[PDB]
Design a protein around this ligand. Structure first.
Ligand SMILES: *[C@@H]1O[C@H](CO)[C@@H](O[C@@H]2O[C@H](CO)[C@@H](O[C@H]3O[C@H](CO)[C@@H](O)[C@H](O)[C@@H]3O)[C@H](O)[C@H]2NC(C)=O)[C@H](O)[C@H]1NC(C)=O
Ligand SMILES: *[C@@H]1O[C@H](CO)[C@@H](O[C@@H]2O[C@H](CO)[C@@H](O[C@H]3O[C@H](CO)[C@@H](O)[C@H](O)[C@@H]3O)[C@H](O)[C@H]2NC(C)=O)[C@H](O)[C@H]1NC(C)=O
Ligand SMILES: *[C@@H]1O[C@H](CO)[C@@H](O[C@@H]2O[C@H](CO)[C@@H](O[C@H]3O[C@H](CO)[C@@H](O)[C@H](O)[C@@H]3O)[C@H](O)[C@H]2NC(C)=O)[C@H](O)[C@H]1NC(C)=O
Ligand SMILES: *[C@@H]1O[C@H](CO[C@@H]2O[C@@H](C)[C@@H](O)[C@@H](O)[C@@H]2O)[C@@H](O[C@@H]2O[C@H](CO)[C@@H](O)[C@H](O)[C@H]2NC(C)=O)[C@H](O)[C@H]1NC(C)=O
Ligand SMILES: *[C@@H]1O[C@H](CO)[C@@H](O[C@@H]2O[C@H](CO)[C@@H](O)[C@H](O)[C@H]2NC(C)=O)[C@H](O)[C@H]1NC(C)=O
Ligand SMILES: *[C@@H]1O[C@H](CO)[C@@H](O[C@@H]2O[C@H](CO)[C@@H](O)[C@H](O)[C@H]2NC(C)=O)[C@H](O)[C@H]1NC(C)=O
Ligand SMILES: CC(=O)N[C@@H]1[C@@H](O)[C@H](O)[C@@H](CO)O[C@H]1O
Ligand SMILES: CC(=O)N[C@@H]1[C@@H](O)[C@H](O)[C@@H](CO)O[C@H]1O
Ligand SMILES: *[C@@H]1O[C@H](CO)[C@@H](O)[C@H](O)[C@H]1NC(C)=O
Ligand SMILES: *[C@@H]1O[C@H](CO)[C@@H](O)[C@H](O)[C@H]1NC(C)=O
Lengths: 240, 40, 314, 47
């Protein structure tokens, strides 16, 4: 577990370093805002239908009455250009807010504990996550358990021992193809089917696919270690 | 040698799982994976 | 999940093949370079929004063609091979029920067409029926369908013997609910009303922008080429800057109404992608989130512009 | 039973506590075993 964990961090270190654009969501927001700022200033080159964008020239060539009739175009133009910037900024900030609510939700549920959410704390079965800072944002290092490797097995819904039908308390009944065992649905670790691994519900009539084997109860051989002890006292009392 | 080749796109290689009313697949090993998720 | 990619060519709507108008539109500098970027950013986001929800699988899972699911009768929800598009009987229902014009508008196709959104929803389903939840969190792994249902039952805390000693009835009441859905979708259309709403918002929004090419905006005349048939150079441009102003406001408002709309569609697709992730790839331990009972499993079918869920509940 | 339940406390504190005589399914499985022994006593007194 530790070697995989230390290799996974050691791979992530190089992966984030190497390829050109892996932080692209943070590139996107530091670009898009800077592009709009640059644009908002560049619009001070436009005439808006006036005689110059350089506003002092509209005092230099035009005077007290008619200069107003130029200027009103530069005002509604510049002010519309600022409205275009603020409306975009309100929208794009709500896109950032709509991330940040997901970020705070993901933070609480993936770092401040263990969400059972599927592919929410990233792909696999979420184990735990670690928060790292970035400029204007967050990176989550999501740690998960992923099923890697497997063998072909057959499963029983239930076991017929007593004609009565037995069921797991946890896990699944499987056969290696000759014998049967009780094992957890996410990882192969067998046991002999006991009364502690299992419970009883009715009998084998109503249920499809149900297989045939005996179930072991440790009482039986434990009390056979007790019947033999008894039988030794019963025989031996013949003698004194 | 290289040119801008165009194609209809693909979603993956064909993988029907060999399902049946008695077959199972239980894992013997697992990866502790790590992934990065970046949020603005 | 997504809108149509309506995009406006910010010159042609303002200036119908006229350089006279285009040179006065250059007197406003870079605005159209940004309005074009604003509608483009919506169009880009529709592909991503379609991908985030449907490309939630990294292989094309498929059923075996023989169908031993214990009376869980999936026949109408899997794709039918005899159909031209490989779509299901639910999808043959859904897909009925929802170039540049002289106005300079344009419309673009999605990155993934209905064959491909169907093959994705078919894999999201086929991993569900062949592999339980597990295709969401590792390699593919076979399991019997009733053992999926057993695990699910134990998951909502009903004991797994309760599945087994009623199976032949359970699967029938499940098929009875599938049957009621096929009849329901054959019987109604207002249920799809949430997909109807997005396209109707876009239909009347397009219709609004079209009507505004007929507005006079205080000018001598409401049509540009009609003015070019009657004025010259100074008493013409005093009219052309106006048409430009009124139409420029039409574009500002059109793109404002669409941008705040594109946030509705993104948020709706983000929720739909979490419900691929958490209803369809999984088993929700959250009350009333997937269906209006204890969740058992969920099955997605492609729709125009969106997805319907069969959210299946105890 | 002793396998459906877990033990706690003593019967004074829990408001709403009813009486009911539980079943310990070990108790007949050691009694079915005690009477097998009782038959070997009822045999061994005879020879
Ligand atoms: C299915 O699972 C069974 C349990 O793992 C397995 O049977 C077991 O086989 C091992 C040897 O491979 C036996 O171990 C004993 O082998 C001999 C017995 O004479 C001794 O030399 C050893 O010291 C050791 O005691 C297990 O006893 C045996 N278990 C049982 C209950 O039979 C099967 O082989 C597996 N099936 C397949 C197809 O592999
Ligand atoms: C699962 O195990 C069951 C118990 O061993 C088994 O059923 C048993 O099958 C035998 C052999 O056919 C029956 O033996 C006699 O049954 C009737 C009389 O009652 C006769 O018609 C037969 O000719 C034969 O003499 C057992 O009675 C029967 N026991 C029970 C409890 O059903 C199943 O066949 C096994 N199934 C599988 C697929 O492993
Ligand atoms: C639940 O069952 C309990 C056990 O029988 C029972 O408790 C018993 O209550 C009676 C009456 O208070 C006690 O009777 C004795 O009380 C004193 C001695 O302690 C004497 O003066 C009396 O003559 C009489 O012997 C029992 O001793 C007491 N037993 C225990 C173990 O607490 C509850 O009353 C029952 N409650 C219900 C609602 O059924
Ligand atoms: C697990 O088994 C599957 C298929 O099941 C077996 O199929 C027959 C060959 C026969 O042995 C049956 O009794 C079994 O039920 C394996 O799937 C095969 O994978 C290979 C590539 O490795 C592919 O070329 C074949 O077409 C597949 N065969 C089928 C029928 O699907 C699978 O690889 C096995 N995996 C492990 C790790 O054991
Ligand atoms: C799980 O798989 C890992 C590899 O990802 C196994 O670890 C390797 O085991 C081989 C020997 O079988 C060694 O040569 C390698 O050096 C090991 N690598 C590491 C990272 O330890 C591991 O043994 C498997 N575990 C189980 C229980 O199957
Ligand atoms: C599963 O359900 C469908 C109905 O939704 C069944 O399809 C019908 O089957 C019969 C026999 O082939 C035909 O006469 C009907 O016309 C079919 N209807 C449709 C819409 O295909 C299907 O047979 C059922 N299968 C099982 C095993 O019950
Ligand atoms: C234990 C059991 O009955 N298994 C059945 C088998 O009988 C049947 O032939 C098969 C059909 O595919 O489905 C499974
Ligand atoms: C209002 C009411 O009915 N309160 C009940 C009471 O009747 C009952 O006798 C008691 C037993 O635990 O529990 C409480
Ligand atoms: C039999 O029991 C006697 C005591 O009654 C004891 O001394 C003796 O060791 C026992 N012998 C055997 C064979 O168990
Ligand atoms: C005593 O035990 C033997 C077997 O060891 C048996 O034959 C006999 O019937 C028994 N006698 C009694 C009285 O039960």
């Amino acid at each position: 577990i530790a070697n995989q964990f230390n290799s996974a961090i050691g791979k992530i270190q190089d992966s984030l370093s190497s390829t050109a654009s892996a932080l692209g969501k943070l590139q996107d927001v530091v670009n898009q805002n800077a592009q709009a700022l640059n644009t908002l200033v560049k619009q001070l080159s436009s005439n808006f239908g006036a005689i110059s964008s350089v506003l002092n020239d509209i005092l230099a060539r035009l005077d007290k009455v008619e200069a107003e009739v130029q200027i009103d175009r530069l005002i509604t133009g510049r002010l519309q250009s600022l409205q275009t910037y603020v409306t975009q900024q309100l929208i794009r900030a709500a896109e950032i807010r709509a991330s940040a609510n997901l970020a705070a939700t993901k933070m609480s549920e993936c770092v401040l504990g263990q969400s059972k959410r599927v592919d929410f704390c990233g792909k696999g079965y979420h184990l735990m996550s670690f928060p790292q800072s970035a400029p204007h944002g967050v990176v989550f290092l999501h740690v998960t358990y992923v099923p890697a490797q497997e063998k072909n097995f057959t499963t029983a819904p239930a076991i017929c021992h007593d004609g009565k039908a037995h069921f797991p308390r946890e896990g699944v009944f499987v056969s290696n193809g000759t014998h049967w065992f009780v094992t957890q649905r996410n990882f192969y670790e067998p046991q002999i089917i006991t009364t502690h691994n299992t419970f009883v519900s009715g009998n084998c009539d109503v249920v499809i696919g149900i297989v045939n084997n005996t179930v072991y109860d440790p009482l039986q051989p434990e009390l056979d270690s007790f019947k033999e002890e008894l039988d030794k006292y019963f025989k031996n009392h013949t003698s004194p | 040698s290289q040119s801008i080749i165009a194609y209809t796109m693909s979603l993956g290689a064909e993988n029907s799982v060999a399902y049946s009313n008695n077959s199972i697949a239980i894992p013997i090993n697992f990866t502790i994976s790590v992934t990065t998720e970046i949020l603005p | 999940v997504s809108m149509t990619k309506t995009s406006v060519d910010c010159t042609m709507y303002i200036c119908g093949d006229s350089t006279e108008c285009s040179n006065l539109l250059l007197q406003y500098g870079s605005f159209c370079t940004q309005l074009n970027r604003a509608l483009t950013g919506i169009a880009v986001e529709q592909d991503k929004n379609t991908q985030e929800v449907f490309a939630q699988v990294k292989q094309i899972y498929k059923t075996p063609p023989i169908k031993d699911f214990g009376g869980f009768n999936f026949s109408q929800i899997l794709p039918d091979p005899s159909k031209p598009s490989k779509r299901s009987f639910i999808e043959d229902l859904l897909f009925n029920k929802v170039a540049q014009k002289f106005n300079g508008l344009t419309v673009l196709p999605p990155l993934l067409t209905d064959e491909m959104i169907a093959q994705y929803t078919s894999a999201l389903l086929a991993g569900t029926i062949t592999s339980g939840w597990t295709f969401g969190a590792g390699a593919a792994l076979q399991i019997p369908f009733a053992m999926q249902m057993a695990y699910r039952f134990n998951g909502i805390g009903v004991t797994q013997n309760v599945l087994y000693e009623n199976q032949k009835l359970i699967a029938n009441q499940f098929n009875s609910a599938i049957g009621k859905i096929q009849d329901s979708l054959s019987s109604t259309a207002s249920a799809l009303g949430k997909l109807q709403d997005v396209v109707n918002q876009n239909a009347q929004a397009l219709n609004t922008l079209v009507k505004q090419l007929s507005s006079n905006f205080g000018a001598i005349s409401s049509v540009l080429n009609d003015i070019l048939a009657r004025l010259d150079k100074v008493e013409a441009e005093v009219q052309i800057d106006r048409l430009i102003t009124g139409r420029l406001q039409s574009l500002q408002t059109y793109v404002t109404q669409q941008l705040i709309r594109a946030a509705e569609i993104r948020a709706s697709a983000n929720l739909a992608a979490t419900k691929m992730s958490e209803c369809v790839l999984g088993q929700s331990k959250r009350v009333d989130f997937c269906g209006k009972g204890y969740h058992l499993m969920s099955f997605p079918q492609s729709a125009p512009h969106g997805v319907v869920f069969l959210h299946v509940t105890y």
